[PDB]
Structure 1
């Protein structure tokens, strides 16, 4: 019979790739269909380049791809339109914002699978030890807490201890972290939904200078090479007061044998002042059937299974990843395991999107400009003022003649 072949997620990021393979195997067992799992590199931008090789070749060797929230405008020609395969009722079981995201020129490129939002992880034990009762609400507070706790922990002998870890590597994750910094300083969305390239402003430049100020001070010098997992490893070993990361890190930190089990909470990222907007970058994954799959019926059946209530529930319960079905945020077992899903649901609902809608198929070029210019600030090569001026000019060149 057919072999249905899936590329999606990575065994190099938490449990995602292992779990995905498990879920695909479970569908194959349930339906009596042969399946195969193709692994991917850790970073989303590397995965895009890999999958583009298959798409350029019109390759039938992958039937289902997991695609990033930022990808529908890029990948649409390589996607089978799913609209004819779902009833309106079935589609309404997902968040409408994400279905809209996934719909390009009327083509439903992909089903919503899990969503994602940047959050603050904090060591509750350490906040209590140093006389703090609440996590920080402002970036200045975060810096003050970090300096005090670091001084104390270093003095106590932990030479591995830092105040803050985040994703500073030059890749798509830095675009995510930098949108949060800029937006939380009142600096805008980098490129607004209407097309205005807004980043050349003093608030954005301040946000980037502030982040530079962390490097080698409250954050390790090596933070300029950290993706999700590098940050998570320092944090999970017990060596950081604070971390910015996605929801997946929570279940991993609570696993038996984690040095930090029971010692942490999560909250919204800080912001520059009380009237700035909360910032949590929208992330997450969708499920696409390849336009090149020889087995579209079967592939669609697999994608409906993966996006189903019970598989999303398993993802929430075991991997602390966020459902794309509003019903699951009221499910007793999801909430018992992850009470913070209820506390931070409004943060997830108000997550700020990267400019993938407005940049469309040029989004990856825009993002590479963002992360390279931002990285130049983190490394001390450019000041934020120059970087945002230079980034404005780059993005203007990239998007010249593009209309959404």
Structure 2
């Protein structure tokens, strides 16, 4: 009978790929359907290019794809419209904002799977060791705490120790980090939902100059090549006071044999001042049935299973990844394992989006301009002032004649 083939998530990032394959096999076993899992590269933008090869070829060789929240506008032609396969009540069990994100020109491209938001990880043991009672609320405080704790730990002999790690590599992760920096300095959303390219302003330039000031100082020099796992590895080995990362790092840091188990908390990222907005970049994944699948009915059943209450629960409990079902945030088991899901729920609800809605199918080109210009600041090649001006000009070129 049919073999249902899935590409989604990566065995190169935490437990996501291994867990995905497990869930797919569990569906196979439960329904008596053969399945295969195709692995993907770590970085989301590498995955887009890979999947685009299948799509260009109209390939039937993958039935279900896991897609990034930033992709619906790009991948819509390659998606089976799911709208006819779900009742309004079923669809209403997901966050409306994400169902809306996934709906392009009335086509429901994909089912919400997990959401995501950038957060601050911090070493509670080290904060207490150095006389601090709360994580930093401002970037200045983060800098001050990082400098003092680094000095003491280095003095105590940990030559691997840093104040702060984050994602500085030139790729989509850097777009995510940089939207947080810019937005939390009152610098806007880079490209506003209305289409205005707003990034050329003093607050955005300050934000980028501030991040350059971290490199080689409180953050390793090599942070300019760090993606999520590079940052997580330095953090998890116990060698960073602070990390900016996504929810998935929490379960991994708590696992048996993690050097930092029981020693950390999470909170909202800092901001430039009390009246700036909190910044948490919206992330997440959706489940798409391929328009080129020979088995749409079976693919849809798999997608419904993966997005179900109990699979999302398993993802929450075991991998500390955020449900797309509001009902899971009141589930006793989800909460007892991850109490911070409740504490940071409003942070997740107010997460700021990358400009994927307004850029649509040109989002990947916009994002590439953003991460390359940001990276030029992190490396000391350009000041933030020049970078935001050059970025404005690039984005204008890229989006000229695009209307939302």
Fold shared per TM-score above 0.5: yes
Secondary structure in 1 aligned to 2:298? helix
Distance in 2 of aligned mates of 1:368 and 1:98: 24
1:393 to partner: Cα distance: 0.0
Query: Post-superposition shift, 1:383?
Result: 0.1
Cα distance per residue 1:270-294 (max 9 Å; x no partner)? 0000000000000000000000000
Q: Tell me the distance in 2 between the aligned counterparts of 1:113 and 1:71.
A: 14
Separation in structure 2 between the aligned mates of residue 152 and residue 332 of structure 1, nearest angstrom? 40
**SS of residue matched to 1:4:** strand
Q: Distance in 2 between matches of 1:86 and 1:185?
A: 41
Q: What per-residue deviation string (whole Å, max 9, x for no partner) do you get for residues 225-246 of structure 1?
A: 0000000000000000000000
User: Deviation of residue 189 (structure 1)?
Assistant: 0.1
Q: Quote how far apart the aligned CAs of 1:178 are.
A: 0.1
Question: Once the two structures are superposed, what CA deviation does each residue of 1:306-338 show, in whole Å capped at 9, x if it has no partner?
Answer: 000000000000000000000000000000000
Summarize deviations over 1:139-175 as a string: whole Å, max 9, x none: 0000000000000000000000000000000000000
2:375 is aligned with 1:372: no
CA distance in 2, matches of 1:237, 1:156: 17
Deviation at 1:250, TM superposition (A): 0.2
Q: Deviations over 1:245-266 (max 9, x none)?
A: 0000000000000000000000
Cα shift readout 1:30-57 (whole Å, capped 9, x = no counterpart): 0000000000000000000000000000
User: What is residue 140 of structure 2 aligned with on the other side?
Assistant: 140
CA distance in 2, matches of 1:316, 1:363: 29
Deviation at 1:207, TM superposition (A): 0.1
What CA distance in whole angstroms lies between the structure 2 residues aligned with 1:229 and 1:300?
Answer: 32
| Structure 1 residue 9, shift from structure 2 partner | 0.1
- For 2:69 and 2:47, the matched residues in 1 are separated by 13
Task: Report the alpha carbon displacement of residue 215 of structure 1 after superposing the two structures with TM.
Answer: 0.0
Q: Which runs of 4+ in 1 moved over 6 A?
A: none
TM-score of the aligned structures, taking structure 2 as reference length: 1.00
Post-superposition offset of 1:118: 0.0
1: CA distance, partners of 2:195 / 2:208: 22
Q: Is 1:291 matched up with 2:291?
A: yes
Q: Deviations over 1:192-235 (max 9, x none)?
A: 00000000000000000000000000000000000000000000
Q: Distance between the aligned counterparts of 2:280 and 2:365, measured in 1?
A: 22
Give the Cα–Cα distance (whole angstroms) in 1 for the partners of residues 71 and 139 of structure 2: 31
Match of 1:196 in 2: 196
1:12 maps onto 2:49 in alignment: no
Q: Count residues in correspondence.
A: 404
Q: Distance in 1 between matches of 2:7 and 2:251?
A: 23
Deviation at 1:364, TM superposition (A): 0.0
User: How far is the alpha carbon of 1:373 from its aligned partner?
Assistant: 0.0
What CA distance in whole angstroms lies between the structure 2 residues aligned with 1:157 and 1:384? 35
- The alpha-carbon deviation at position 185 of structure 1 amounts to 0.1
Deviations 1:338-357 (A, max 9, x none): 00000000000000000000
Unaligned runs of 5+ in 1: none
- Output the aligned Cα RMSD: 0.1
Per-residue CA deviations over 1:338-383 (Å, capped at 9, x if unaligned) read 0000000000000000000000000000000000000000000000
CA distance in 2, matches of 1:34, 1:150: 53
Q: In structure 1, what is the Cα distance between the partners aligned to 2:155 and 2:293?
A: 59
CA offsets, 1:290-309, max 9 Å, x none? 00000000000000000000
> Which residue matches 2:282?
282
Secondary structure of the equivalent of 1:214?
coil
